[PDB]
Amino acid sequence: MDARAVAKRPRDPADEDNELVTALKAKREVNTISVRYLYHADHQALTARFFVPEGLVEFEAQPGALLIRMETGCDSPRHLYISLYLLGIRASNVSASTRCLLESVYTASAARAALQWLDLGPHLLHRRLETLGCVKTVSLGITSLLTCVMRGYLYNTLKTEVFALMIPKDMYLTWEETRGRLQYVYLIIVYDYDGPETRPGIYVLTSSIAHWQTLVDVARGKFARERCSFVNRRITRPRQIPLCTGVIQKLGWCLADDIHTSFLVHKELKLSVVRLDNFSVELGDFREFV
Amino acid sequence: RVASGAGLPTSRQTTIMVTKYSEKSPITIPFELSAACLTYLRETFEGTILDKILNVEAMHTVLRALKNTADAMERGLIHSFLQTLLRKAPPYFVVQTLVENATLARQALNRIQRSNILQSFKAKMLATLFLLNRTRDRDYVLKFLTRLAEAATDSILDNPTTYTTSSGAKISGVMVSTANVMQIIMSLLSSHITKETVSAPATYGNFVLSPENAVTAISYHSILADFNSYKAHLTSGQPHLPNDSLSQAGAHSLTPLSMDVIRLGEKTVIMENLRRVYKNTDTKDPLERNVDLT
Amino acid sequence: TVSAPATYGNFVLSPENAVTAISYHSILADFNSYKAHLTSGQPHLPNDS
Amino acid sequence: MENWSALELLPKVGIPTDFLTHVKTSAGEEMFEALRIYYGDDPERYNIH
């Protein structure tokens, strides 16, 4: 170590020639493969590749769909990858007309299998779900390939276009009149304990609050009826041991001015969505509240 | 059209427009480098001889990877082209039924005409299912190959200077099959097989956008190839163009290389087996297929 | 007493205008100026068509 | 949709065409992806706009 070594500012990652160019220059050998520029070499987002059967890929052809991993309770597929739209079928929050529309969209054996597996078991819904991230690609086929980011912005190969996050309009939720400049977005699953069986509500919440306790206090204010239902079931129906009235999972952050309303088209049917233009994913785990 | 006599309906003049589109089929293959390779590629610990050995090893590793991947890309291009050709190529009974019924109709098919077509399909499918197993007569297989060559239609572009021999009578087609079948045919029809040197293009042709094409691509999302020739012919009044944009994109230099050809009735075609491409690879040769009968 | 133009103005299509009119149903007036400026890399045209 | 008038006006390359079957048979039996057939003389190509 010496003074000049300390003074020297670090090398620019962009002005050093890459390893392949280094080797070719060292031997002074030509190659057919273009090598001077490496694509995705400066993508800071972390991505993964997922295989999914043809029946499940609908409304996820467009980039920006939220991707969930669901448990089948079986050893043959073990896990399936489904979108928030498919969960729209099961959620009580979604209206009748939209439910009919996106139920007519998912008329495939795989989607119906997913629904049967979801309703079959005795567990609560959130125990069967694991969130992966947002998708931005599609290669269609009998088995389709989806690439999903799990930490970062949504953009194509050259960053020449940034993708948004699409939320169906019935699931979108806000609790403040004037938005804070920075918004955090959360996934909420809340259970209503009626007589026969629990009806789950599914929401995506955009909020300025980052503290857990304040956020959960606001949520308990907004969902008082479901807490009353939880206590009522605890009283009337012993030997049923419910847990939780709802769970909250954090996934992402975006600016308030990026929020917009839009529609999605698939097989000449229009679904209306809320659109988070420059959304960047940052996943948390399910935290439960009562 | 032909002038008709009295009492018959006259044939009105008609013009037909068709257009053909291109299809895309990208290929890919990965190669991997270890972090140990990457660190020793660009680091020198005290410069001892062992460190030099490790640097040399990292360099040779990445070089081997690059060469292997380039060879794989060449093989993959061949594989993709062969798959496309097989996708568009119909079987023998279809094409021979078509050639035998070429003058049958001058319109969309009747019930009766397509019934005859179906009968021909069934008969020829049963008669020629496994050619070399049911016969090895020299004349019969020669006629069968001649029919296969004759049935195919001509291409709309023809560069007369390429794929020609010192015998310069021109080559017209290529016939490809597995090594075993080619061996059987060559031993059976050796009186027609010859060894030849053929002049083939040494490099790919180059297609370049003109600045007019750049402007139209920006403004209208479309390019018309050979824009200036179109504009000059259109303004001068000449109705015909001397050449095609794709044809004039062809390479100029051509190299000689050796291959076998067969004569099929004043028609010479090339014979090749692709055993080299799939010698030790994971992919199956797409000319080795399974067939189902019920 | 004022000075006024003595004659009307004349606007005429270029051959490349004819080609784009026939193909794309559109005209970019002064096409060659756009071509030359775009290729040379300079951003400003001297005057409009 | 394809604008056939542009093909009809612009210069064309002379080719010896080779349909194995009759042209109207190959067109009627739907060999080609896109097709336009007209009889007599069609004035469409004359109204450049």
Q: How far apart are CA D18 and CA B153, in angstroms?
A: 6
Are A44 and A136 within 8 A, CB to CB?
A: no
Supply the DSSP symbol for C29.
Answer: S
User: With touching defined as 3+ CB pairs under 8 A, do chains A and C touch?
Assistant: no
HSE-CB of B163 using CA atoms within 13 angstroms: 12
Contact A25, A17 (CB under 8 A): yes
- Contact residues, C window 1-49, toward D, CB-based 8 Å cutoff: 19, 21-23, 25
B173 with B152: CB under 8 angstroms?
yes
Do the chains contact at C39 and B224, CB–CB below 8 Å?
no
A-B C-beta contacts closer than 8 Å: 29
Method: cryo-EM
- C-alpha B220/C-alpha B223 separation (Å) is 8
* CB contact at 8 A, A227 and A245: yes
Residue-by-residue DSSP string for A29-87: ---SS--SS-TTTT--SEEEEEEEEGGG-SS-SSTT-EEEEEE-SSSSS-EEEEEHHHH
CA distance C42 to A260: 38
Q: Do B162 and B233 meet the contact criterion of CB atoms below 8 Å apart?
A: no
Contact D10 C21 (CB under 8 A): no
Give the H/E segment covering residue B257: strand B254-263
Mutate to test the interface with B, among C24, C30, C32, C42 (most CBs of B within 10 A): C24
Amino acid identity, position D40: G
Resolution (A): 3.0
Neighbouring residues of A224: CB distance < 8 A, sequence distance ≥ 6: none
CA distance B224 to B230: 9
Residues near B196 by beta carbon (within 8 Å), at least 6 away in sequence: B165, B166, B167, B258, B259, B260, B261
The span from the CA of A119 to the CA of A199, in Å, is 11
Cα separation, A84 vs A65, in Å, equals: 7
Q: Residue D11's closest chain C neighbor by CA?
A: C19
CB neighbours of residue A96 within 10 Å: 7
Give the span between the Cα atoms of A133 and A282, in whole angstroms: 8
Rg (CA), chain D: 13
Q: How many CB atoms lie within 10 A of CB C21?
A: 15
Q: Taking the C-alpha atoms of A25, A29, A34 and A38 in order, what is their torsion angle to the nearest 10 degrees? A: -30
Q: Tokens 């739209």 map to which residue?
A: A85
C-beta of residue B142 within 8 angstroms of C-beta of residue B189 = yes
Contact B234 C15 (CB under 8 A): yes
CA distance, residue D12 to nearest chain C CA (Å): 14
Beta partners for A206? A174, A185
What is the three-class DSSP state of A229?
A: helix
Compute, in degrees rounded to 10, the torsion defined by CA atoms B46, B47, B52, B54: 10
C9 contacts: CB under 8 Å, gap ≥ 6:
none
Give the C-alpha separation, B186 to B204, whole Å: 31
Q: Is A243 exposed, middle or buried (0-12, 13-18, 19+ CB in 10 A)?
A: exposed
CA distance C29 to B251: 36
User: Which amino acid would we find at residue B108?
Assistant: A
Q: Spell out where chain D has E strands.
A: 12-13, 34-39
* Nearest Cα to Cα of residue A266 among A99, A54, A94, A58: A58
